[PDB]
Assembly symmetry: C3
Homo-oligomer: 21 residues x 3
């Protein structure tokens, strides 16, 4: 599968997450 | 929001950008 | 063009690939 990269950002706090397809 | 990352490339050069959703 | 990035995962190997738009 492919894993794209995003940051999940909220109230001045970001965390990297994968989005798997 | 989610922030994805892309290299935005012109003829000679590339910059990293966030694409925010 | 924009180049996005993904980890392409097979049975064992994982490599980062670009994806161009």
């Amino acid at each position: 599968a492919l894993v794209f990269f995003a940051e999940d950002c909220g109230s001045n706090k970001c965390a990297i997450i994968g989005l798997m397809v």
